Amino acid sequence: SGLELYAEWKKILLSPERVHEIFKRISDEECFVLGMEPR
Protein backbone atom coordinates (compact mmCIF):
# COMPACT_ATOMS: atom_id res chain seq x y z
CA SER A 1 0.00 0.00 0.00
CA GLY A 2 1.75 3.19 -1.26
CA LEU A 3 5.21 2.60 0.32
CA GLU A 4 4.93 -0.55 2.52
CA LEU A 5 4.15 -4.20 1.58
CA TYR A 6 2.33 -6.39 4.17
CA ALA A 7 2.26 -10.24 4.13
CA GLU A 8 -0.88 -12.08 5.39
CA TRP A 9 -1.03 -15.91 5.75
CA LYS A 10 -1.70 -11.12 10.64
CA LYS A 11 -0.76 -8.73 7.77
CA ILE A 12 2.69 -7.87 9.25
CA LEU A 13 4.67 -5.16 7.35
CA LEU A 14 7.70 -6.55 5.43
CA SER A 15 11.19 -5.60 6.71
CA PRO A 16 13.75 -4.40 4.09
CA GLU A 17 16.62 -5.59 6.37
CA ARG A 18 14.88 -9.02 6.61
CA VAL A 19 14.43 -9.16 2.78
CA HIS A 20 18.13 -8.17 2.28
CA GLU A 21 19.26 -10.96 4.69
CA ILE A 22 17.06 -13.51 2.81
CA PHE A 23 18.61 -12.33 -0.52
CA LYS A 24 22.15 -12.96 0.85
CA ARG A 25 20.96 -16.45 2.00
CA ILE A 26 19.45 -17.11 -1.51
CA SER A 27 21.76 -19.44 -3.54
CA ASP A 28 23.50 -18.09 -6.70
CA GLU A 29 22.25 -21.10 -8.75
CA GLU A 30 18.55 -20.45 -7.85
CA CYS A 31 19.16 -16.73 -8.62
CA PHE A 32 20.33 -17.81 -12.13
CA VAL A 33 17.16 -20.00 -12.45
CA LEU A 34 14.89 -16.91 -12.03
CA GLY A 35 16.83 -15.08 -14.81
CA MET A 36 19.39 -13.02 -12.85
CA GLU A 37 23.04 -13.91 -13.66
CA PRO A 38 24.67 -14.03 -10.16
CA ARG A 39 27.98 -12.21 -10.93
Q: Does 26 bind other proteins (CB under 8 A)?
A: no
Q: How far apart are CA 28 and CA 17, in angstroms?
A: 19
CB 3 within 8 A of CB 13: no
Q: Does 18 bind other proteins (CB under 8 A)?
A: yes
Candidate list 8, 11, 12, 23; residue touching other proteins; CB under 8 A: 12
Q: What are phi and psi of 7, to 5 degrees?
A: -105, 125
Q: How far apart are CA 33 and CA 5, in angstroms?
A: 25
Q: Does 35 bind other proteins (CB under 8 A)?
A: no
Q: Does 11 bind other proteins (CB under 8 A)?
A: no
Residues near other proteins (CB under 8 A) are 2-4, 12, 15, 17-18, 21, 25
